[PDB]
Design a protein around this ligand. Structure first.
Ligand SMILES: *[C@](=O)([C][C][C][C][C][C][C]/[C]=[C]\[C][C][C][C][C][C][C][C])C1=NN=C(C2=[C][C]=[C][C]=N2)O1
Ligand SMILES: *[C@](=O)([C][C][C][C][C][C][C]/[C]=[C]\[C][C][C][C][C][C][C][C])C1=NN=C(C2=[C][C]=[C][C]=N2)O1
Ligand SMILES: [Cl-]
Lengths: 543, 546
C-alpha cells in the first residue's frame, strides 16, 4: 500500500538488468567462439597506459579489448552485483571511436548517474524508473570523442547520499575482497568493478567522499577534483540548486597514471566548448610529471573519527617513506574541523531541513543501507531542536548533527555561504603559513560491513572536510590489514563513545587482508600536483 | 536620530579635504623641480606607450606619478570623484618592481578595494573610521606588477546604485556636463578616468557598475566572469549571496589598457594569493586574433526602449562590422523579463532586503537611491498586496515588488537551480547559432543626477549578463547629436510606467555626451570579448589605437 508503483518499478528494473546481463553474455560467448586462442589474462592484466599504447599501435584490436573486458565484467558481477545496465550502443561506438583519441578503444565504466542516451539513471529511486535519458551527458560525449567506449552503468546506493551501495531496484553491491563487506559508495559499483578487474577506468561523483570511499574500500585509486574542474552538465541528481557544498566528478582506476590520463583526456577543447561554464584549464603535464621535493603536511587523526589501527599505520608508514625519499613532513591539521563538519557541511547539504531531498523518497521504499537518515530528516524542525538540546549534554556530536539539518531562511543560507567562504580562506591561510605543497591524511578503512556505513555517519569526517573546503582530494592504496591491526581494533573506543563510534568498531571486525588507503590533498585547481603526490605515494608504498 | 550619521559625514569630509591638500602640496613641490616637463604630452600618451617609456627609462616613475596626481587633483575640482589619497604610494613608487608589467603606472581604485590604513565606507556611516588592515588581493598583485595605486574614488551609498552620491563624500558629477550622472557604482572611476586623471582603474559590477560609468563618461570597461579575478578583500555590504555573482575588472581610456591590466593581474602572484581563482593565464593569441567573427546582435531587449542615440550607436557599429567582413546574426536571449524580474531581482533580494537594510540602520538615505530603501522596508505581505494591485496596469513594477520578498533556503535552492538552467539555455541558444560574440545596446547617454535610482528598469541591458555571468564590456562609439536628442521627445518606453517616464526625461539635454555599445562573450572568454571590443573600437574610433 503506497508501494504499488515502487514495486512495479523494481520488477521492471530487475528485468532490464537481467536482460542486459544476458545480452552481455551472448556477445561474449560469440566473441570467444571466434577468438579461442586470445590470451585474455595477458590483456586484462595490462596496465591501462600499456593497453592504450597497444590499441593506438594496432597490436591489440578494439574488439579484442572490448569483449575480453565485457566478459570479465559479466563474470565479476556474479559475486558483486555491481552492474545495473549494459550500454548496448557500445558495439557501434566501438567501431566509430576516433582513432587518434587519447582513450582510443578503452572500455570505460560509468556510475549510473552519468546520463547515457536511451538509459535510465534511476539512482535506485522509483520515481526515476522508465525515464530514459534523451542524450549522453557532456563527460560521456567527451569520452566518446576521445575514443573511449562506455560499456556499463554501475550500481549506487538509493539516492547516492550514502557511502554504502544498495537500492530497492537493483539491490546490494558487495565488496569483491569479502562479500560481507561494503564496496563503499556511492560510486560502489565502480569500486567493485574496477577493483575486481572488470574495468580499466571509470567515472564517479563525490559530494562527501563517494569517489574516495569505494576506491579505498576496494583497493583502487580515485581522484575528486575541485568541483568545477570537470563538467556536471547532464549528470542525474536528486537535489537541485544546493551550491554551498558542490558536487565533483572524477576518475577511478587501478593506478595513479590512469587517473592522470583520464583527466588529461577530459580537459580538452571538446569539454570546454560543450560546457562553457567550466574554466578552460588544460592538464598541466609539467606539474604532474615533476619530481621536486615536497613540503607535505600530515596528520594521523582528525580528532573526530579515531583512525582504525590499520589507518594510522598506513598513514605513519607513508609519512616515513616520504621522509626517506627526501620530502619534508610537517604536522598539520586544518582548524575547526568540528565546525566544518557539523555546521558548514551538514548545514550546506541540508539547509532546507532535507525537504527537497525527501521528495525523492515519496511513495518509495527506504533501503536499509540508508539507516535512519530519512526518518531523522523527516522529523519536524522543532523536534530536531528539542531532541538536539536533550542529547547535547551526553552526545554533542549527535546533538550538533540534528540541530544543523533543520530548515532555515534564505538570509541564514547567505550567512552560511559566507561562513563556508571565510572557512576556505582560513584553511588556505593556515596552509600558506606553513608553506605546504600538499597534505597527507588518513582515509577511512578498511571496508565496513554491509549496511553499517548508514549508521556510522561521523566516519565521513576525513573525506567530507575536502568537499566543504573544495580542495582536490584523491586516495591511493598503501597496505592491507594485518592480524595485529585487526586484533588492535578490539580495543577501539573513539573520541565520543556515541552510536557512530560504537558501530564502527563492530563494522570493521574481521578485516584481515583488506586494502587500506591514504588521502592526498592539494589546493583548489591543483589536480596535477595532487596527482603528482599520489604518484609518489604509489611509487613508495607499492613499488 | 542622526547625530552619528552627521559626525561620520563631518569626519569623512575632513579626511577627504586633508587628502586633497596633501596631493596639492606634493604636486606643487614636484612641479617647481620640473618646470620643463611636457605634462600634456605625458598625460595624453596611450597607456601602452606610457608603459613602454617607463620600462625603457625614458619617463621616470615620479614624472608620471606627480603629473597624473596633478591632473587627478585638478579634475576632482569639478567632479568630486576622489575620496582619499593613498598616502603610502610614494614609498611604493620608489619600491616598484622594475620588470613589473605595470611598472610606474598610477592606478585609481574604487573605494571598495581594501587598502591598508584606509576606510572602505561605501558611503555608509557604519563603515566610517574603520580602516582596512591589509590590501585586497588585486591591490597586492597590482603592486607586485610595479603599479602605484594612488586614490580611492567615490561610490553611491552602499554601491547598490548606478548613480554616484553618498551622505559622507557627496555627489560625483559627470565630467562632460555637471548636471549629469557619471554612472556607477564605479562612478568616481568613470569621472576620473574620463577626464584624464587616471590611465587605469578598477571597478566592480553586480548589475552594470563597471559598464554604466564607462558608457556615461565615455571610457572603456570590462566586467569579466565572476571568478576570473580575486574578490578577496573587497568590501561589500551583503555577503554570501551567490545567485547573481559580483565581478571586478578594469576601466580605462582604450581597450588595449583593459587587456594589459588583465594580463598583469592573471599572473602567478594572483593565483598563489587566491587559490580559489582558476589559474587561467591571459591568452594573448586569442586577444590578438584577426579572424572574422560571428556576431550576434540586438538593437533592443524589448524591456528598456533604447534612446535614439543608443540605437544609432548599435546600428552604425553593426554596419561597420558587416563592412569589415564579420557575419552579423540577429540574436536575443530568451525570456529576458523572467531573467530580470524573477532570477536577477529574486537573486539580489532573496532575503527581502534585510541583510542589505542593516547597513542603513541609523544612517541618512542618499536621495540618489530613490525609494529603494523605503520599498525594501515594506512588510512582505504589503509588497505582495501592492504587487497584486499594480499588476493589471504596471506589471513590471508589480513583478519587482513580488520578487523582492524574503524566502526559505528551499526556495533559494529552487531559484539557484533556475539560474543555472537559464545560463545553460542561453548557452544552448548561442551554440545553436554558432556565435563567437554578441553585440548589444548599452544604456546611454548619461542620466541626469538623481534619476538612475528612479529608473531601475534601465539596468536591463547590463544586469542580464550578471545573471548569466558572461564577460561583458563597453566601448564608446559615438556622441549624442542634436538630431538624436530632439528625437527623445518621441520616446514613450514599452510600458509607460514611472521607470519609462523617469528615463525619458533623464536622457534629454544630452547633446555631445558619449554613447557606447556592449560586447559579450561566453563564460571565461575575456580574451575573445576584448578581441571584439578592440575591433569595435578600431572601426568606430580608429585613432584610439594605431
Ligand atoms: C557521495 O560523496 C556521498 C558520500 C557521503 C555520504 C553521506 C552520508 C551521511 C549523511 C550526511 C552527512 C552530512 C555531513 C556529516 C558531517 C559529520 C557529522 C556531523 C555522493 N556521490 N554522489 C552524491 C550525490 C548526493 C546527492 C546528489 C548528487 N550526488 O553523493
Ligand atoms: C553595481 O553593479 C550596481 C549597479 C546596479 C544597480 C541596481 C539598482 C537597482 C536595484 C535593483 C535592481 C534589481 C534588478 C532589476 C531588474 C529590472 C527590473 C525588474 C555594483 N557595484 N558593486 C555592487 C555591489 C553591490 C552589493 C554588494 C557588492 N557590490 O553593485
Ligand atoms: Cl569557478
Amino acid at each position: 500500500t503506497g508501494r504499488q508503483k515502487a514495486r512495479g518499478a523494481a520488477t521492471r528494473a530487475r528485468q532490464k538488468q537481467r536482460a542486459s546481463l544476458e545480452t552481455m553474455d551472448k556477445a561474449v560467448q560469440r566473441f570467444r567462439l571466434q577468438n579461442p586462442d586470445l590470451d585474455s589474462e595477458a590483456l586484462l592484466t595490462l596496465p591501462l597506459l600499456q593497453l592504450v599504447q597497444k590499441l593506438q599501435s594496432g597490436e591489440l584490436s578494439p574488439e579484442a579489448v572490448f569483449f575480453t573486458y565485457l566478459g570479465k565484467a559479466w563474470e565479476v558481477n556474479k559475486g558483486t552485483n555491481c552492474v545495473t545496465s549494459y550500454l548496448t550502443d557500445c558495439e557501434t561506438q566501438l567501431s566509430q571511436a576516433p582513432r587518434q583519441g587519447l582513450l582510443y578503444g578503452v572500455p570505460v565504466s560509468l556510475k549510473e548517474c552519468f546520463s547515457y542516451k536511451g538509459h535510465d539513471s534511476t539512482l535506485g529511486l522509483s520515481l526515476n524508473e522508465g525515464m530514459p535519458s534523451e542524450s549522453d551527458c557532456v563527460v560521456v560525449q567527451v569520452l566518446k570523442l576521445q575514443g573511449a567506449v562506455p560499456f556499463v552503468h554501475t550500481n549506487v546506493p538509493q539516492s547516492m547520499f550514502s557511502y554504502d551501495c544498495s537500492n530497492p531496484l537493483f539491490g546490494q553491491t558487495m565488496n569483491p575482497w569479502k562479500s560481507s563487506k561494503s564496496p563503499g559508495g556511492s560510486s560502489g559499483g565502480e569500486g567493485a568493478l574496477i577493483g575486481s578487474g572488470g574495468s580499466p577506468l571509470g567515472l564517479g561523483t563525490d559530494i562527501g567522499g563517494s569517489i574516495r570511499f569505494p576506491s579505498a574500500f576496494c583497493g583502487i585509486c580515485g581522484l575528486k577534483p575541485t568541483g568545477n574542474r570537470l563538467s556536471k552538465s547532464g549528470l542525474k541528481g536528486c537535489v537541485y540548486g544546493q551550491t554551498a557544498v558542490q558536487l565533483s566528478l572524477g576518475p577511478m582506476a587501478r593506478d595513479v597514471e590512469s587517473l592522470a590520463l583520464c583527466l588529461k583526456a577530459l580537459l580538452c577543447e571538446h569539454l570546454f566548448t560543450l560546457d562553457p561554464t567550466v574554466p578552460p584549464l588544460p592538464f598541466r603535464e609539467e606539474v604532474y610529471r615533476s619530481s621536486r621535493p615536497l613540503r607535505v603536511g600530515y596528520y594521523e587523526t582528525d580528532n573526530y573519527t579515531m583512525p582504525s589501527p590499520a589507518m594510522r599505520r598506513a598513514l605513519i608508514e607513508t609519512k616515513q617513506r616520504l621522509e626517506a625519499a627526501g620530502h619534508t613532513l610537517i604536522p598539520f591539521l586544518p582548524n575547526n574541523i568540528p565546525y566544518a563538519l557539523e555546521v558548514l557541511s551538514t548545514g550546506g547539504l541540508f539547509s532546507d531541513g532535507g525537504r527537497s531531498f525527501l521528495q525523492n523518497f515519496k511513495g518509495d521504499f527506504v533501503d536499509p543501507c540508508l539507516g535512519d537518515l530519512i526518518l531523522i530528516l523527516r522529523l519536524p524542525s522543532w523536534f530536531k531542536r528539542l531532541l538536539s538540546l536533550l542529547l547535547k549534554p551526553l552526545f554533542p556530536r549527535l546533538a550538533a548533527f540534528l540541530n544543523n539539518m533543520r530548515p532555515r531562511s534564505a538570509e541564514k543560507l547567505w550567512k552560511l555561504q559566507h561562513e563556508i567562504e571565510m572557512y576556505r580562506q582560513s584553511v588556505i591561510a593556515q596552509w600558506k603559513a606553513m608553506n605546504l605543497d600538499v597534505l597527507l591524511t588518513p582515509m577511512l578503512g578498511p571496508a565496513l560491513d554491509l549496511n553499517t556505513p548508514g549508521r556510522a555517519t561521523g566516519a565521513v569526517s576525513y573525506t567530507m572536510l575536502y568537499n566543504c573546503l573544495d580542495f582536490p582530494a584523491g586516495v591511493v592504496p598503501v597496505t592491507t590489514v594485518t592480524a595485529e591491526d585487526d586484533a588492535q581494533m578490539e580495543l577501539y573506543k573513539g573520541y565520543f563513545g556515541d552510536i557512530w563510534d560504537i558501530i564502527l568498531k563492530k563494522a570493521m571486525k574481521n578485516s584481515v587482508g583488506l586494502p587500506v588507503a591514504v588521502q592526498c590533498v592539494a589546493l583548489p585547481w591543483q589536480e596535477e600536483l595532487c596527482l603528482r603526490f599520489m604518484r609518489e605515494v604509489e611509487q613508495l608504498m607499492t613499488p
